[PDB]
């Protein structure tokens, strides 16, 4: 068995010796190798060093070729042999990468064997133009109540997850990946969504714990993890968002739908700033190069919703940006805000108070908006958005309002229930029917008698009663696609029956 596999790997790995156009390393240092030779080499062509490291031909000069090393530059010495790969920089793509953890070059790192991909795709492909795109009209279900109602994400949208450190940015992104299991297990392939998680500059232990979480929840079957951790070279962390984007662009161009998370692009900008400063390029704002905007703009513009003449596929991007002391006016976050289609802002102050996810409702924007959410969610979240705005205006009167009007007290009481409604535990994403029912109960006044400290327990028990005793209500909602006034009266009665049965 093992001997047969070992024998067929020896026989299958034929050397195929032939003369290759080669170069010679002149000087190596600061992640840049200057190579003498390679007359017929192309710009941005991948090379092979004698130690096995890959590199990208960045600068073509009359006398030398500047090569960006995809690895540690201690493996390259002056006078080494640099061979042309003959191809511009590309990574393996396909459905053979699902369930596999790879580095920025596409090589597996989880030890599960090689990757049997038959296709490769360039990492520097330009984004689709005006014509092949179409409007974003299919929902992206993150499973988060506060996201899917107030900052609704569509398929083909770029939604920024921005905040300070340890505010739940990875928690939102991972729960969005886990939530797609209910759609991937179903037979409806148009709602199926593949996932690509790109870890840039993170800790390798953190990536391993993420892969364990995806494996336990069975979310790894449709997920590709591209890992360029903090121990990896800056060119590897620079390349990894484009490598993962190419793997996600395989699904976009083949009629399927993919979600990609760049966690985080602020660390990729640091890696690119390191490469730019070691190339003597003129620093700008916060020592960043001038093309650090084009670094993220050429990446995120490849996340698009394609027209029916292009297969109808899509790529959805969730870039992550870490701020410093909640400063969204800094250079790098302002660049990504000008690129993406809206941002989800996470507050440190809300995170300290126990509000998780600590989403700032007033500072979270979805430029697509209601155009990419279901009728039932849009009809209810429109009312909740108005009521949260009303609660926000009168929140200043709660500080000293010992005596307050009945209308203002109702607005304060409703806003407290709605704020407690949006709280959600980690690694427990919710189906869209469960989200609609819970938000509908809190927005119609059913929770005005329920204490805010018992809303989460009411959320489990009342949904269980609906899922067991009143399944005909859900069937009517699923058939109609919205909430009828007849169903509104029925939901009023079963809420009154449920609260009376719990206590009287």
């Amino acid at each position: 068995e093992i001997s047969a596999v070992l024998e067929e790997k020896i026989l299958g790995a034929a050397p195929k010796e032939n003369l290759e156009e080669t170069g010679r390393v002149l000087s190596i240092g600061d992640g840049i190798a200057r190579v003498y030779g390679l007359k017929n080499i192309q710009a941005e062509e991948m090379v092979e060093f004698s130690s096995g490291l890959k590199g990208m031909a960045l600068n073509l000069e009359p006398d030398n070729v500047g090569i960006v090393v995809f690895g540690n530059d201690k493996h390259i010495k002056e006078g080494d042999i640099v061979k042309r790969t003959g191809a511009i920089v590309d990574v393996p793509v396909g459905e053979e990468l699902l369930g596999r953890v790879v580095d920025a070059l596409g090589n597996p790192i989880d030890g599960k064997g090689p990757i049997g991909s038959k296709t490769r795709q360039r990492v520097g492909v330009k984004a689709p133009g005006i014509i092949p795109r179409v409007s974003v009209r299919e929902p992206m279900q993150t499973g988060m109540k506060a996201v899917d109602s107030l900052v609704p994400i569509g398929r083909g949208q770029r939604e920024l997850i921005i905040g300070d450190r340890q505010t739940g940015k990875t928690a939102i992104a991972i729960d969005a990946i886990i939530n797609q299991k209910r759609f991937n297990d179903a037979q409806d392939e148009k709602k199926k969504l593949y996932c690509v998680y790109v870890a840039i500059g993170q800790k390798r232990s953190t990536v391993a714990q993420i892969v364990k979480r995806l494996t336990d929840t069975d979310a790894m079957r449709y997920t590709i993890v591209v890992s360029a951790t903090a121990s990896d070279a800056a060119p590897l962390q620079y390349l990894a968002p484009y490598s993962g984007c190419a793997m996600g662009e395989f699904f976009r161009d083949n009629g399927k739908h993919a979600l990609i998370i760049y966690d985080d692009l602020s660390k990729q900008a640091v890696a690119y700033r390191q490469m730019s400063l070691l190339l003597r390029r003129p620093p700008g704002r916060e020592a960043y190069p001038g093309d650090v905007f084009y670094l993220h703009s050429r990446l995120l513009e490849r996340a698009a919703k394609m027209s029916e003449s292009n297969g109808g596929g899509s790529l959805t991007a969730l870039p992550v940006i870490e701020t410093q002391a909640g400063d969204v006016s800094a250079y790098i976050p302002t660049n990504v805000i000008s690129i993406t289609d809206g941002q989800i802002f996470l507050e440190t102050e809300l995170f300290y108070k126990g509000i998780r996810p600590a989403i700032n409702v007033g500072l979270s924007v979805s430029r697509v908006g209601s155009a990419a959410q279901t009728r039932a969610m849009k009809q209810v979240a429109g009312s909740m958005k108005l009521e949260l705005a009303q609660y926000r205006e009168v929140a200043a009167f709660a500080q000293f309002g010992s005596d307050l009007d009945a209308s203002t007290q109702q607005l304060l009481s409703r806003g407290v229930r709605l704020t407690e409604l949006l709280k959600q535990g980690q690694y427990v994403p919710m189906a869209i029917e469960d989200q609609v029912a819970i938000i509908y109960c809190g927005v119609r006044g059913h929770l005005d008698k329920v204490e805010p400290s018992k809303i989460t327990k009411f959320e489990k028990e009342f949904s269980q009663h609906i899922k067991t005793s009143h399944r005909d209500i859900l069937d009517t909602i699923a058939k109609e696609g919205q909430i009828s006034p007849d169903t509104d009266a029925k939901l009023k009665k079963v809420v009154t029956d449920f609260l009376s049965t719990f206590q009287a």
Partner: protein, 53 residues
């Protein structure tokens, strides 16, 4: 799961053991007559690549 992990652990140590055994056996088995035959094959392969043009 216990039998699968036991099989995987035994497979891994057997793969490691056979790798170092092959490396040591290949390195220790060097003969000059075979070395000259491989040298002649390398020259013939170089001559074949020169013809292939």
């Amino acid at each position: 799961d216990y039998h699968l992990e036991t099989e995987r652990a035994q497979r891994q140590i057997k793969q490691k053991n056979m790798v170092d055994w092959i490396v040591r056996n290949v390195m220790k088995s060097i003969t000059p007559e075979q070395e000259r035959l491989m040298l002649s094959k390398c020259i013939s392969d170089l001559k074949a690549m020169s013809i292939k043009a």
